[PDB]
DNA sequence: GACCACGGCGCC
DNA sequence: AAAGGCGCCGTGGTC
């Protein structure tokens with residue numbers, strides 16, 4: 001491959017080396033580009049960044065985020081990772097993709113640029129005549145990479161001093177709990193070691209082991225086990241409380257304040273575009289899609305995510321999105337009329353679980369009801385239904401005679417979905433995103449049945465993901481116009497930041513864009529709230 | 540220091 | 552522990 005002096009012509013493919021994976025923290029070690037049988041290697045990569053008009057190549061978005069960090073608008077364009085991921089969503093890393101589609105992912109920018117060029121050639125050919133995947137690439141994934149780059153580079157503000165104070169308070173409560181556990185154990189041990197805990201609970205104390213761990217067959221110490229032991233010894237309660245606190249402390253309270261960026265004063269996640277089997281995004285480095293919210297301490301942590309001075313957070317959450325998608329994908333009339341009319345199913349379940357009027361339902365009672373209706377839907381055991389409801393098997397089985405009894409075409413839809421996955425080797429979303437599920441004709445029931453659950457979940461979860469992504473693509477230019485920002489995506493929700501004076505307008509526009517993204521046989525409802533913090537913006 | 544598997548658990 | 556999708560923790564082990 002011919003070496004030519006740096007600058008490349010327009011439309012060249014880029015290769016780059018980062019000192020580390022996170023583009024907001026990374027030093028740009030090298031930059032190169034490829035076109036027309038020439039490779040161009042940058043003498044000094046930061047300065048060489050100014051010459052490009054767009055990031056075109058493997059991991060295009062990551063380079064674009066680093067460009068934005070440096071005050072440059074270098075939007076991501078074609079990325080062979082996105083083409084390969086649409087073909088087969090197990091194409092998630094560039095190591096894998098290079099080997100599969102015609103090269104080797106090295107640690108050299110020039111080779112990486114050449115690799116991008118020839119991988120795009122090959123992958124663009126594989127998507128010839130794959131009209132619906134091409135639509136997803138042009139209308140969702142490629143434009144979405146730009147949106148996510150802005151989200152990544154913008155970050156979210158975090159109340160740091162508040163989290164530091166919270167840390168010292170939770171440290172004292174943890175100390176209280178561990179001292180009481182050690183007394184009840186009759187000795188101190190490492191309470192964070194589940195192996196040590198196993199021996200204390202089941203050998204030294206006499207408590208009955210319920211279940212076993214999956215890979216190594218040890219006696220389980222999980223919450224589900226411990227809940228069934230909640231009055232068989234006073235120690236179990238303390239352990240459950242200790243687990244809650246140390247999880248939140250070790251994962252959220254302590255690490256997040258140390259991740260504030262020195263230039264932005266904000267906390268920056270990565271939104272991974274080729275990481276799931278269904279077409280959802282993921283978030284990492286720090287994961288901001290699992291910030292807690294259920295428990296009171298969880299809520300305290302969520303209040304730490306705050307609007308910039310003079311701005312408000314706007315949180316928009318789709319209501320019962322997968323259930324509405326199912327009504328559409330299947331065509332079940334009784335499910336369609338429930339949404340056409342305007343009933344609630346999470347609240348319907350909660351008021352019958354807890355045995356209270358509907359007016360007496362609240363947020364945390366609906367939390368319980370989400371394990372039940374989703375859980376039950378995607379192939380839950382009658383037996384486990386009994387456990388989390390905490391009732392007999394006779395009442396848990398008859399619920400899956402009622403949750404299903406009314407809806408003939410859901411069953412027919414699952415079965416149709418499974419038979420097509422067996423035939424074609426893949427299942428698909430409403431827009432034709434594929435997941436290959438090979439184990440549907442496996443000869444071992446438990447493997448076959450796990451594969452089935454995965455297979456009929458994907459059109460549902462994947463369609464909801466497609467809708468949210470499309471909604472993000474259309475919403476983004478409208479917010480830039482209003483001087484507003486998109487901060488986070490959490491599967492079925494978005495969090496925006498709007499100047500105080502334009503917040504209510506932003507809220508109304510965003511809602512309307514999300515409700516009418518792609519009309520279905522049933523309406524999409526979005527709940528919206530505005531606030532100084534992430535918690536209060538939903539309440 | 541790094542990587543990994545595992546159990547465990549946060550969110551959707 | 553009991554018939555969906557993730558990423559990150561501490562442990563325990565390894566190199």
Ligand SMILES: Nc1ncnc2c1ncn2[C@H]1C[C@H](O)[C@@H](COP(=O)(O)OP(=O)(O)OP(=O)(O)O)O1
Nearest residue numbers: 317318319320321322323370371374375492551555
């Ligand atoms: N426990 C779960 N198991 C499987 N899927 C889940 C679970 N919790 C949530 N999801 C999926 C299904 C939801 O439609 C989707 C979005 O989550 P979420 O907002 O919490 O519930 P929801 O959209 O159905 O109700 P709502 O928004 O009205 O409170 O993610």
Ligand SMILES: [Mg+2]
Nearest residue numbers: 317318492493
């Ligand atoms: Mg939600």
Ligand SMILES: [Mg+2]
Nearest residue numbers: 544545546547
């Ligand atoms: Mg695991």
